[PDB]
Amino acid sequence: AVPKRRTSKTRKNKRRTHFKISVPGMTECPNCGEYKLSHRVCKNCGS
Amino acid sequence: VKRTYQPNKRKHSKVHGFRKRMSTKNGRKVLARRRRKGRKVLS
Amino acid sequence: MEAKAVARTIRIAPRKVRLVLDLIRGKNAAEAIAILKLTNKASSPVIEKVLMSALANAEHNYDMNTDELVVKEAYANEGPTLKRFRPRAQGRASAINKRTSHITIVVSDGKE
Amino acid sequence: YRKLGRTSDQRKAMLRDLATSLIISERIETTEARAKEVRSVVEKLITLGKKGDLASRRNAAKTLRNVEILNEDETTQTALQKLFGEIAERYTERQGGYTRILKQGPRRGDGAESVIIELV
Amino acid sequence: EARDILKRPVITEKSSEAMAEDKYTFDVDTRVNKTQVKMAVEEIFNVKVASVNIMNYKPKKKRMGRYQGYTNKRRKAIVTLKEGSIDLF
RNA sequence: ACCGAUAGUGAACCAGUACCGUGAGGGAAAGGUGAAAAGCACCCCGGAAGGGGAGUGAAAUAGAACCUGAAACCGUGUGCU
RNA sequence: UGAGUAGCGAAAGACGGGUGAGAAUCCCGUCCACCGAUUGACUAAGGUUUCCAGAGGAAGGCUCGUCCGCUCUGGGUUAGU
C-alpha cells in the first residue's frame, strides 16, 4: 500500500498529459464590445 | 477521560513554595543550584 | 518594443496558477482578457489584474498601440514557502506547505 | 424527479419556502437545479388560483406559508389573498408558461451556475 | 505628606459623566487608604468630602516586536463632595 | 605555525532566554546595505500588496539588501529525435 | 516523490434588502426548524484581560471574509451589611 520506488520526472510529466483546462464558448456580442458566455443573460444573450 | 495535573493555586505554593524550599537543607541546595545556573524563576 | 509587469509574493500554489497561464500564451491582448473573464478559477482574477498593468505600461512609458499587442511570454516562478502544523491521530503532527508565486507577463507587438 | 441532496421532509419544506418567496417579489435568484424544481410547483399553485373555488383555496393553503406583504398606502395582505387576487387576474387567457428561467454567471464561493426565475 | 498621596487627576468619558455631580476621580498611591485620601483632598482644595471609593487594577501586559513587559499597578479613587467645586482646567 | 558563525563557551544577536516537564531537571534557532541615508521627490496600473518609468549613487547593492554553488529541486524558449 | 491524492471533527436552512474593489460565509427583516431536567439560568475550582468602542485581517483562525467566543492599534471592575 506504499510506493515501492520513487517516481521520476519523466513518468510524473507523462501522467499530467490530460490534466488541463479547456477554452469556453465565449459568444460575440452585437452591441456591447465585451464578450459573454453562450445562452447567458447580458447584451448579447448568445448569437 | 480524567487526565493528570489538576490545577490548584494553594497546593502549588504549599509544595513548590519559596518558604517550603527554605524549611529543609536539601531544598536549600536546589535554590543554590538554580542560582548558580542563573535561572530567572527560582520557584 | 516590449513591456512587462510582475506580481511578487502571490498567496497561491504555482501548480494551480500554471493551469490558467497555458490558455493566454501566444494569444492577443483582447482575446486573453475575454478568456480570463470566462475562466472559472481563483487565479483568473489575479492574473487579469497583472495583464491590465502590463498593457498600461506599454501605452504610457512606450506610448505603443494597445489595439495590436500580443502576449509574448507568461510564466510563474516559486517564492518563499511558509511552514505550518496541524495535529494527527496520536501525539504526532503533520506538516503543511503554504507556497507563494511570482507571476510575470511580457506584452509585445512582434516588431524589433 | 430530483432530490437536491436533502431529506424527504427537508426537501418538502424548502420547496414550500421558495414557492412563497417567488410570489412575494415575483423575481428570485437561486441555483439551476432548484430553479428547475420550483418551476413545476409554483405553476400548479397559479392553476389552483385560476379556479377560484373554495376547494382550491383549502388546497392552496396546504403549500403556501403564512406571510404578510406590504403594498403602497400602508396596505397589508397575506400571500394566499395575493395569489387569488391580482396574480389570478393577470394570467386568465394564457394556458401554461407563467414562470421563465434566465441563466447567469457562476458564483464566487463555489462553481454553482446561478439563474433567475421570474413570472412572465 | 498630604501632597504625594495624589499623583494626577483622570480625564475620560466616564469621569466627565461622573463630573456632572460632586464626584471626582484621582490617581492615588498604591499604599494609602481611603481615610488618608479624604484627609488630604479636603486640605488641598479646602472642601467637604462626603464619601470615598477605592479600586485596584492588575498590571496589563504589553509588547512591540520582540519586547515583553507589563504596566504599573494603579489605584483609582472617586471622591464625593458635600458642597463646593474643583477648578480642573 | 588557537577558532573564524554547523567552528569557538550552551550563549558574538532577544541565553540559561522561545519552548518542554506537577517537580528535581532538560535546553535551542538566529552575525554582514553603502565611503556617506544621499532609504527611490514625481508620474502611470491597482482597493492594497506589488510593479513600470524617473531620480540619488562608482554600482540597486532597496531595507526576505556583500559573494549566492548546489545532490538539489521548479520553470520559459529553442537545434536534432 | 506518493498527489492535486486522503482529509476539511456537533442542529436544516429559504429568499429579500444593506454595505463594499470584491459576499453561499458580515449586518438588518420575514418565514422555517433544533435543544427542551437541557447546546437554559446561576455560584465555586481554574484561566488571567479573552470583556467595551473605533480603526485593520497584511500573518493566524482546516474554504471565503468587508469578519471568525477571533487575532494586530484606545478605554473599563466603586461595599459599615
Coordinates of C-alpha atoms (C1' of nucleotides) in Angstrom, one line a residue:
Chain A
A1 CA 0.0 0.0 0.0
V2 CA 3.2 2.2 -0.2
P3 CA 5.2 3.2 -3.3
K4 CA 7.9 0.5 -3.9
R5 CA 10.1 3.0 -5.9
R6 CA 10.1 6.9 -6.2
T7 CA 8.5 8.3 -9.4
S8 CA 10.9 10.0 -11.9
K9 CA 10.4 13.4 -13.7
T10 CA 9.6 11.6 -17.0
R11 CA 6.8 9.3 -15.6
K12 CA 5.4 12.2 -13.5
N13 CA 5.2 14.5 -16.5
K14 CA 3.6 11.7 -18.6
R15 CA 0.7 11.3 -16.2
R16 CA -0.1 15.1 -16.4
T17 CA -0.9 14.9 -20.2
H18 CA -4.8 15.1 -19.9
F19 CA -4.6 17.3 -16.7
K20 CA -5.5 20.7 -18.1
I21 CA -8.5 23.2 -18.6
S22 CA -10.5 23.7 -21.9
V23 CA -11.3 27.1 -23.6
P24 CA -15.0 28.1 -23.1
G25 CA -17.7 29.1 -25.7
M26 CA -17.3 32.9 -25.5
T27 CA -20.1 34.2 -27.9
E28 CA -19.5 37.6 -29.5
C29 CA -22.0 40.4 -28.5
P30 CA -23.9 42.5 -31.1
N31 CA -23.7 45.9 -29.2
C32 CA -21.5 46.0 -26.0
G33 CA -17.9 45.4 -27.2
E34 CA -17.1 42.9 -24.4
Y35 CA -17.6 39.1 -24.8
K36 CA -20.1 36.8 -23.0
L37 CA -20.9 33.1 -22.4
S38 CA -23.3 31.3 -24.8
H39 CA -27.0 31.1 -23.7
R40 CA -26.4 33.7 -20.9
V41 CA -28.1 37.0 -19.7
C42 CA -26.4 40.2 -21.0
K43 CA -26.4 42.5 -24.1
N44 CA -25.6 39.5 -26.4
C45 CA -27.7 36.6 -25.0
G46 CA -25.8 34.2 -27.3
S47 CA -25.8 34.6 -31.2
Chain B
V1 CA -11.1 10.9 30.2
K2 CA -9.8 12.3 33.6
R3 CA -6.2 13.4 32.8
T4 CA -3.4 14.2 35.4
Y5 CA -2.2 17.5 36.8
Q6 CA -5.3 19.1 38.3
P7 CA -4.5 22.9 38.7
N8 CA -4.6 24.2 42.3
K9 CA -3.2 27.5 43.5
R10 CA -3.0 26.8 47.3
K11 CA -1.3 23.3 46.9
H12 CA 1.1 24.6 44.2
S13 CA 2.6 27.2 46.7
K14 CA 2.3 24.8 49.6
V15 CA 4.7 22.3 47.9
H16 CA 7.0 24.2 45.4
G17 CA 6.8 27.5 47.5
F18 CA 10.0 29.5 48.4
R19 CA 9.3 29.2 52.2
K20 CA 8.8 25.4 51.8
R21 CA 12.2 25.1 50.0
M22 CA 13.9 27.2 52.8
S23 CA 12.5 24.9 55.5
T24 CA 14.9 22.0 54.9
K25 CA 18.6 21.5 54.0
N26 CA 18.1 19.5 50.7
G27 CA 15.6 22.2 49.5
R28 CA 18.2 25.0 50.1
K29 CA 20.7 23.1 47.8
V30 CA 18.1 23.3 45.0
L31 CA 17.8 27.1 45.3
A32 CA 21.7 27.4 45.4
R33 CA 21.9 25.1 42.3
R34 CA 19.3 27.2 40.3
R35 CA 21.0 30.5 41.5
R36 CA 24.4 29.2 40.2
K37 CA 22.9 28.3 36.7
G38 CA 21.3 31.7 36.5
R39 CA 17.6 30.7 36.2
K40 CA 15.2 33.7 36.2
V41 CA 12.5 31.8 38.2
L42 CA 13.7 30.2 41.5
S43 CA 10.2 28.9 42.4
Chain C
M1 CA 9.2 47.2 -28.3
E2 CA 8.4 45.2 -25.2
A3 CA 6.6 45.9 -21.9
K4 CA 6.4 43.7 -18.7
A5 CA 4.7 43.6 -15.3
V6 CA 5.4 41.2 -12.3
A7 CA 3.5 40.4 -9.1
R8 CA 5.7 39.1 -6.3
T9 CA 4.6 37.1 -3.1
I10 CA 1.2 36.0 -4.5
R11 CA -0.5 33.6 -2.0
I12 CA -1.4 30.8 -4.5
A13 CA 0.3 27.4 -5.3
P14 CA 2.4 27.7 -8.5
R15 CA 0.9 24.4 -9.9
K16 CA -2.6 25.9 -9.8
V17 CA -1.6 29.3 -11.4
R18 CA 0.3 27.5 -14.2
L19 CA -3.0 25.9 -15.4
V20 CA -4.5 29.3 -16.4
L21 CA -1.2 30.6 -17.9
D22 CA -1.4 27.9 -20.7
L23 CA -4.6 29.5 -22.1
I24 CA -3.4 33.1 -22.8
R25 CA 0.2 32.1 -24.0
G26 CA 0.6 33.4 -27.7
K27 CA -2.9 35.0 -27.9
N28 CA -3.9 38.7 -28.5
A29 CA -4.5 41.2 -25.6
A30 CA -8.2 41.4 -26.5
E31 CA -8.8 37.6 -26.6
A32 CA -6.7 37.0 -23.5
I33 CA -8.8 39.5 -21.4
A34 CA -12.0 37.8 -22.7
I35 CA -10.7 34.3 -21.9
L36 CA -9.7 35.4 -18.3
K37 CA -13.3 36.8 -17.7
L38 CA -14.9 33.4 -18.8
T39 CA -12.5 31.0 -16.9
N40 CA -13.9 29.8 -13.6
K41 CA -10.7 29.7 -11.4
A42 CA -9.2 31.5 -8.4
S43 CA -6.2 32.7 -10.4
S44 CA -8.1 34.3 -13.3
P45 CA -9.0 37.5 -11.3
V46 CA -5.4 37.9 -10.0
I47 CA -3.8 37.2 -13.5
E48 CA -6.2 39.6 -15.2
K49 CA -5.1 42.5 -12.9
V50 CA -1.4 41.8 -13.8
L51 CA -2.1 41.6 -17.6
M52 CA -4.0 45.0 -17.3
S53 CA -1.0 46.7 -15.7
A54 CA 1.4 45.3 -18.4
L55 CA -0.8 46.9 -21.2
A56 CA -0.9 50.3 -19.4
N57 CA 3.0 50.4 -19.2
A58 CA 3.2 49.7 -23.0
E59 CA 0.8 52.6 -23.7
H60 CA 2.4 55.2 -21.3
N61 CA 6.1 54.5 -20.9
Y62 CA 6.5 53.4 -24.5
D63 CA 3.3 55.0 -26.0
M64 CA 2.6 52.0 -28.2
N65 CA -0.7 50.9 -29.8
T66 CA -2.8 48.7 -27.5
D67 CA -5.0 47.5 -30.4
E68 CA -2.2 45.4 -31.9
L69 CA -0.4 43.8 -28.9
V70 CA 0.2 40.1 -28.4
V71 CA 1.2 38.2 -25.1
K72 CA 4.8 37.1 -25.8
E73 CA 5.9 35.4 -22.5
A74 CA 3.8 34.3 -19.5
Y75 CA 5.2 32.1 -16.6
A76 CA 5.1 31.8 -12.8
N77 CA 8.1 31.1 -10.5
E78 CA 8.1 29.8 -6.9
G79 CA 8.6 32.1 -3.9
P80 CA 9.2 31.9 -0.1
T81 CA 7.2 29.0 1.5
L82 CA 5.6 29.2 4.9
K83 CA 5.7 26.2 7.3
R84 CA 2.6 25.3 9.4
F85 CA 1.5 22.4 11.7
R86 CA -1.8 20.5 12.4
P87 CA -2.4 17.6 14.8
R88 CA -2.8 13.9 13.7
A89 CA -4.3 10.6 15.3
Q90 CA -2.0 10.3 18.4
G91 CA 0.6 12.8 19.6
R92 CA 2.1 13.2 16.0
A93 CA 1.9 16.4 13.9
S94 CA 1.8 16.6 10.1
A95 CA 3.5 19.5 8.1
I96 CA 1.6 22.0 5.8
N97 CA 3.2 24.0 3.0
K98 CA 1.8 27.4 2.1
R99 CA 3.7 28.1 -1.2
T100 CA 3.5 31.5 -3.0
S101 CA 4.1 32.5 -6.7
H102 CA 5.9 35.1 -8.9
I103 CA 3.6 35.8 -11.9
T104 CA 5.2 37.6 -14.9
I105 CA 3.7 38.7 -18.2
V106 CA 5.6 40.3 -21.2
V107 CA 3.4 42.0 -23.8
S108 CA 4.8 43.0 -27.3
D109 CA 3.7 43.9 -30.9
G110 CA 6.1 41.4 -32.5
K111 CA 8.5 44.0 -34.0
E112 CA 12.2 44.6 -33.3
Chain D
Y1 CA -37.5 13.8 -10.1
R2 CA -34.5 15.4 -8.3
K3 CA -33.7 15.0 -4.6
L4 CA -31.5 18.2 -4.3
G5 CA -29.2 16.4 -1.7
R6 CA -31.8 16.7 1.1
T7 CA -34.2 14.5 3.2
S8 CA -37.9 13.9 2.2
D9 CA -39.1 16.3 4.9
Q10 CA -36.3 18.9 4.4
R11 CA -36.8 18.9 0.6
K12 CA -40.6 19.3 1.1
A13 CA -40.0 22.3 3.5
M14 CA -37.5 24.1 1.2
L15 CA -39.9 23.8 -1.9
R16 CA -42.7 25.4 0.1
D17 CA -40.4 28.3 1.1
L18 CA -39.1 29.0 -2.4
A19 CA -42.7 29.0 -3.9
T20 CA -43.9 31.5 -1.2
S21 CA -40.8 33.7 -1.9
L22 CA -41.4 33.7 -5.7
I23 CA -45.0 35.0 -5.1
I24 CA -43.9 37.9 -2.8
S25 CA -41.4 39.7 -5.1
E26 CA -42.1 37.6 -8.3
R27 CA -38.3 37.7 -9.1
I28 CA -35.9 35.4 -7.0
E29 CA -32.3 34.3 -7.9
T30 CA -31.0 30.8 -6.9
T31 CA -29.2 27.7 -8.3
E32 CA -30.3 26.0 -11.6
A33 CA -31.2 22.6 -10.0
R34 CA -33.6 24.3 -7.5
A35 CA -34.9 26.6 -10.3
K36 CA -36.0 23.5 -12.4
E37 CA -37.8 22.0 -9.3
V38 CA -39.8 25.1 -8.1
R39 CA -40.9 25.9 -11.7
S40 CA -43.3 22.9 -11.6
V41 CA -44.6 23.7 -8.1
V42 CA -45.5 27.4 -8.4
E43 CA -47.1 26.7 -11.8
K44 CA -49.6 24.3 -10.0
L45 CA -50.3 27.0 -7.4
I46 CA -51.3 29.5 -10.1
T47 CA -53.6 26.9 -11.7
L48 CA -55.5 26.5 -8.3
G49 CA -55.8 30.3 -8.1
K50 CA -57.4 30.5 -11.6
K51 CA -60.2 28.1 -10.4
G52 CA -61.3 30.5 -7.6
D53 CA -63.4 27.8 -5.9
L54 CA -63.5 27.1 -2.1
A55 CA -61.9 23.7 -2.6
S56 CA -58.8 25.2 -4.4
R57 CA -58.4 27.8 -1.5
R58 CA -58.0 24.9 1.0
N59 CA -55.8 23.0 -1.5
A60 CA -53.6 26.2 -2.0
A61 CA -53.3 26.6 1.8
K62 CA -51.5 23.1 2.1
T63 CA -48.4 24.6 0.4
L64 CA -48.4 28.4 0.7
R65 CA -46.8 29.7 4.0
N66 CA -48.2 32.5 6.3
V67 CA -46.5 35.8 5.4
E68 CA -47.7 39.5 5.4
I69 CA -47.0 41.5 2.1
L70 CA -46.8 45.4 2.4
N71 CA -48.2 47.3 -0.6
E72 CA -48.5 51.1 -1.2
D73 CA -50.6 53.4 1.1
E74 CA -49.8 51.1 4.2
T75 CA -51.8 48.2 2.6
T76 CA -51.2 44.7 4.0
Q77 CA -52.4 41.3 2.6
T78 CA -51.5 37.6 3.0
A79 CA -49.7 35.7 0.2
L80 CA -52.8 33.5 -0.3
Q81 CA -55.0 36.6 -0.9
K82 CA -52.5 37.9 -3.4
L83 CA -52.3 34.5 -5.2
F84 CA -56.2 34.6 -5.6
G85 CA -56.0 38.4 -6.3
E86 CA -54.0 40.4 -9.0
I87 CA -51.9 37.2 -9.9
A88 CA -55.1 35.3 -10.8
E89 CA -56.4 38.3 -12.9
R90 CA -53.1 38.7 -14.7
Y91 CA -52.9 35.2 -16.2
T92 CA -56.5 34.3 -17.3
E93 CA -56.1 33.9 -21.1
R94 CA -52.6 32.3 -21.0
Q95 CA -52.8 28.4 -20.7
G96 CA -49.3 27.4 -19.5
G97 CA -45.9 29.2 -19.2
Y98 CA -46.3 31.6 -16.2
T99 CA -42.6 31.3 -14.9
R100 CA -39.4 31.9 -17.0
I101 CA -35.7 30.9 -16.4
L102 CA -32.7 33.2 -17.2
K103 CA -29.1 31.7 -17.0
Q104 CA -26.4 33.9 -15.3
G105 CA -22.7 33.5 -14.4
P106 CA -21.1 31.2 -11.8
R107 CA -20.8 32.0 -8.0
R108 CA -17.5 33.0 -6.2
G109 CA -17.7 30.8 -3.1
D110 CA -18.3 27.7 -5.3
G111 CA -18.7 26.9 -9.0
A112 CA -22.6 26.8 -8.9
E113 CA -24.4 28.0 -12.1
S114 CA -26.9 30.6 -10.6
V115 CA -30.1 31.6 -12.6
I116 CA -33.1 34.0 -12.3
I117 CA -36.7 32.7 -12.1
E118 CA -39.4 35.3 -12.7
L119 CA -43.2 35.3 -13.7
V120 CA -44.0 36.4 -17.3
Chain E
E1 CA 2.9 64.3 53.3
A2 CA -0.7 65.1 52.1
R3 CA 0.7 66.1 48.6
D4 CA 2.5 62.9 47.4
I5 CA -0.7 60.8 48.1
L6 CA -2.4 62.2 45.0
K7 CA -0.5 61.6 41.7
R8 CA -2.7 63.2 39.0
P9 CA -6.4 63.5 38.0
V10 CA -8.2 61.2 35.5
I11 CA -10.0 62.8 32.4
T12 CA -12.1 60.3 30.4
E13 CA -15.7 59.9 29.1
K14 CA -16.7 58.1 32.3
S15 CA -15.2 60.8 34.6
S16 CA -17.0 63.6 32.6
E17 CA -20.4 61.8 33.1
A18 CA -19.5 61.4 36.9
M19 CA -18.3 65.1 37.0
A20 CA -22.0 66.2 36.5
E21 CA -22.5 65.7 40.3
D22 CA -19.9 66.3 43.1
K23 CA -17.7 63.3 42.1
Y24 CA -14.0 63.5 41.0
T25 CA -11.5 60.7 40.1
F26 CA -7.8 60.9 41.2
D27 CA -4.7 58.6 40.9
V28 CA -3.6 58.0 44.5
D29 CA -0.6 56.0 45.7
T30 CA -0.7 52.1 46.0
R31 CA -0.1 52.1 49.8
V32 CA -2.5 54.8 51.2
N33 CA -6.1 54.0 52.4
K34 CA -9.4 56.0 51.9
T35 CA -9.2 57.8 55.3
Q36 CA -5.9 59.4 54.3
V37 CA -7.3 60.2 50.8
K38 CA -10.3 62.1 52.4
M39 CA -7.9 63.8 54.9
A40 CA -5.6 65.0 52.1
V41 CA -8.1 66.1 49.4
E42 CA -10.1 68.3 51.8
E43 CA -6.9 70.1 52.9
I44 CA -5.6 71.0 49.4
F45 CA -8.8 72.2 47.8
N46 CA -10.4 73.3 51.1
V47 CA -13.7 71.4 50.5
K48 CA -16.0 68.9 52.4
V49 CA -15.8 65.2 51.4
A50 CA -18.9 63.0 51.9
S51 CA -17.6 59.6 50.9
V52 CA -14.6 57.9 49.1
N53 CA -14.4 54.8 46.8
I54 CA -11.1 52.9 46.1
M55 CA -10.4 50.1 43.5
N56 CA -7.2 48.4 42.5
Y57 CA -6.0 47.5 38.9
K58 CA -3.8 44.5 37.9
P59 CA -0.8 45.2 35.6
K60 CA -1.6 45.0 31.9
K61 CA 0.8 43.1 29.6
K62 CA 2.2 44.9 26.5
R63 CA 4.5 44.2 23.5
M64 CA 6.1 46.0 20.4
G65 CA 8.1 43.4 18.4
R66 CA 10.4 41.1 20.5
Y67 CA 9.8 43.3 23.6
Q68 CA 7.8 41.8 26.5
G69 CA 6.8 43.7 29.7
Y70 CA 3.9 44.8 32.0
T71 CA 2.4 48.2 33.2
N72 CA 2.5 49.7 36.7
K73 CA -0.2 48.9 39.3
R74 CA -2.8 51.7 39.5
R75 CA -5.1 52.7 42.5
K76 CA -8.2 54.7 41.3
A77 CA -10.1 56.8 43.9
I78 CA -13.6 58.5 43.5
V79 CA -14.1 61.4 46.0
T80 CA -17.7 62.8 46.6
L81 CA -18.1 66.5 47.8
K82 CA -21.0 67.7 50.0
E83 CA -20.6 71.3 48.9
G84 CA -18.0 73.1 46.7
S85 CA -16.2 72.5 43.4
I86 CA -12.7 71.8 41.9
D87 CA -11.0 74.1 39.3
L88 CA -10.0 71.2 36.9
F89 CA -9.0 73.2 33.8
Chain F
rA1 C1' 52.9 27.6 12.9
rC2 C1' 44.4 28.8 18.8
rC3 C1' 38.9 29.1 16.4
rG4 C1' 36.6 32.5 12.5
rA5 C1' 29.4 31.9 12.9
rU6 C1' 27.2 23.5 11.9
rA7 C1' 33.9 26.4 14.4
rG8 C1' 35.0 28.9 19.4
rU9 C1' 31.7 28.8 25.7
rG10 C1' 25.1 26.1 25.9
rA11 C1' 25.2 31.7 24.6
rA12 C1' 29.3 37.2 19.0
rC13 C1' 22.1 38.6 18.2
rC14 C1' 16.2 38.6 22.1
rA15 C1' 20.8 32.6 26.8
rG16 C1' 20.3 29.9 30.8
rU17 C1' 16.1 33.4 27.1
rA18 C1' 11.4 30.7 22.9
rC19 C1' 10.0 26.2 24.5
rC20 C1' 9.4 21.2 27.3
rG21 C1' 8.1 18.8 32.3
rU22 C1' 3.4 18.5 38.6
rG23 C1' 8.7 18.6 40.2
rA24 C1' 14.2 17.8 40.6
rG25 C1' 15.6 19.0 35.7
rG26 C1' 16.4 19.4 30.1
rG27 C1' 17.6 23.3 26.8
rA28 C1' 17.7 25.6 21.1
rA29 C1' 17.5 28.7 16.2
rA30 C1' 19.4 33.5 14.8
rG31 C1' 26.1 37.9 12.5
rG32 C1' 27.3 41.2 7.1
rU33 C1' 23.1 47.6 2.5
rG34 C1' 26.6 51.9 1.4
rA35 C1' 32.5 55.8 1.9
rA36 C1' 28.2 59.0 3.3
rA37 C1' 20.6 57.5 4.3
rA38 C1' 22.4 60.7 -0.2
rG39 C1' 16.4 54.8 2.4
rC40 C1' 13.5 55.5 -4.7
rA41 C1' 10.6 63.5 -4.7
rC42 C1' 7.4 63.0 -9.1
rC43 C1' 4.1 60.5 -13.0
rC44 C1' 1.2 55.8 -14.5
rC45 C1' -1.8 50.4 -13.4
rG46 C1' -4.2 48.8 -8.8
rG47 C1' -8.8 48.7 -3.0
rA48 C1' -4.0 47.4 -1.3
rA49 C1' 0.4 44.5 -1.9
rG50 C1' 3.3 44.7 -6.0
rG51 C1' 5.2 46.7 -10.3
rG52 C1' 6.9 50.2 -14.9
rG53 C1' 9.3 54.8 -15.6
rA54 C1' 12.1 59.0 -13.4
rG55 C1' 15.6 60.2 -9.9
rU56 C1' 20.4 59.6 -5.5
rG57 C1' 24.9 56.5 -6.2
rA58 C1' 31.2 54.4 -8.7
rA59 C1' 27.4 50.1 -8.8
rA60 C1' 20.4 48.8 -6.6
rU61 C1' 23.6 47.0 -3.5
rA62 C1' 16.5 48.8 -1.7
rG63 C1' 15.6 47.7 3.8
rA64 C1' 13.2 38.3 3.0
rA65 C1' 19.9 44.3 0.9
rC66 C1' 28.3 41.6 0.4
rC67 C1' 29.7 36.6 -2.8
rU68 C1' 24.9 33.3 -3.8
rG69 C1' 27.3 26.8 -5.5
rA70 C1' 24.1 23.0 -5.3
rA71 C1' 22.6 16.2 -4.7
rA72 C1' 19.3 19.6 -5.4
rC73 C1' 14.6 21.0 -6.9
rC74 C1' 10.8 24.3 -10.2
rG75 C1' 10.1 26.5 -14.8
rU76 C1' 10.1 29.5 -20.2
rG77 C1' 12.2 29.4 -25.3
rU78 C1' 14.7 26.8 -28.8
rG79 C1' 18.8 23.0 -32.7
rC80 C1' 18.5 17.2 -33.6
rU81 C1' 14.9 13.0 -32.3
Chain G
rU1 C1' 8.2 11.5 -4.8
rG2 C1' 3.4 9.4 -3.2
rA3 C1' -0.7 13.9 -5.4
rG4 C1' -3.8 17.9 -7.0
rU5 C1' -4.5 12.0 -4.0
rA6 C1' -6.5 11.1 1.7
rG7 C1' -8.9 14.6 4.8
rC8 C1' -11.8 19.6 5.8
rG9 C1' -14.0 16.9 13.6
rA10 C1' -21.9 18.8 16.8
rA11 C1' -28.9 21.3 14.9
rA12 C1' -31.9 22.5 8.4
rG13 C1' -31.9 26.1 6.4
rA14 C1' -35.1 29.9 2.2
rC15 C1' -35.4 34.4 -0.1
rG16 C1' -35.4 40.0 0.1
rG17 C1' -32.9 44.4 1.3
rG18 C1' -27.7 46.8 3.1
rU19 C1' -22.6 47.8 2.9
rG20 C1' -18.3 47.1 -0.1
rA21 C1' -12.7 46.9 -5.0
rG22 C1' -14.7 42.0 -4.2
rA23 C1' -20.4 38.4 -0.5
rA24 C1' -23.2 30.7 -0.3
rU25 C1' -20.0 32.7 4.6
rC26 C1' -20.7 40.1 7.5
rC27 C1' -25.4 43.4 9.1
rC28 C1' -31.0 44.1 9.3
rG29 C1' -36.1 41.8 8.0
rU30 C1' -39.9 37.8 7.4
rC31 C1' -40.7 32.8 7.4
rC32 C1' -38.7 27.6 8.9
rA33 C1' -36.5 24.3 12.3
rC34 C1' -33.4 22.1 16.6
rC35 C1' -32.2 21.6 22.3
rG36 C1' -36.2 21.3 25.6
rA37 C1' -34.2 18.0 34.0
rU38 C1' -31.2 21.0 28.7
rU39 C1' -26.5 23.1 23.4
rG40 C1' -31.2 27.1 29.7
rA41 C1' -30.2 30.3 34.3
rC42 C1' -26.8 30.9 38.4
rU43 C1' -22.4 30.2 42.4
rA44 C1' -17.2 27.7 43.2
rA45 C1' -12.3 25.5 41.3
rG46 C1' -9.2 27.1 37.5
rG47 C1' -7.5 30.7 33.5
rU48 C1' -5.6 35.9 33.8
rU49 C1' -7.6 41.0 30.1
rU50 C1' -10.1 36.8 26.2
rC51 C1' -14.6 41.9 28.5
rC52 C1' -16.3 47.6 25.6
rA53 C1' -15.7 51.3 21.5
rG54 C1' -13.2 52.9 17.0
rA55 C1' -9.7 51.7 13.2
rG56 C1' -7.1 46.9 10.2
rG57 C1' -7.4 40.8 8.9
rA58 C1' -1.1 42.1 5.9
rA59 C1' 0.1 36.7 9.1
rG60 C1' -3.2 33.2 12.3
rG61 C1' -8.1 31.1 12.5
rC62 C1' -8.7 23.5 8.1
rU63 C1' -12.8 27.3 2.3
rC64 C1' -14.4 32.7 2.0
rG65 C1' -14.4 37.2 4.8
rU66 C1' -16.0 43.8 4.4
rC67 C1' -15.5 39.2 10.0
rC68 C1' -14.1 34.1 12.9
rG69 C1' -16.4 33.4 21.5
rC70 C1' -11.1 35.8 16.7
rU71 C1' -6.0 37.8 16.1
rC72 C1' -2.7 43.2 15.4
rU73 C1' -3.5 49.8 17.2
rG74 C1' -7.8 53.2 23.0
rG75 C1' -10.8 52.6 27.5
rG76 C1' -13.4 49.7 31.5
rU77 C1' -14.0 46.3 37.9
rU78 C1' -16.6 51.6 43.3
rA79 C1' -19.3 47.7 49.6
rG80 C1' -20.1 49.5 57.8
rU81 C1' -24.5 44.7 55.7

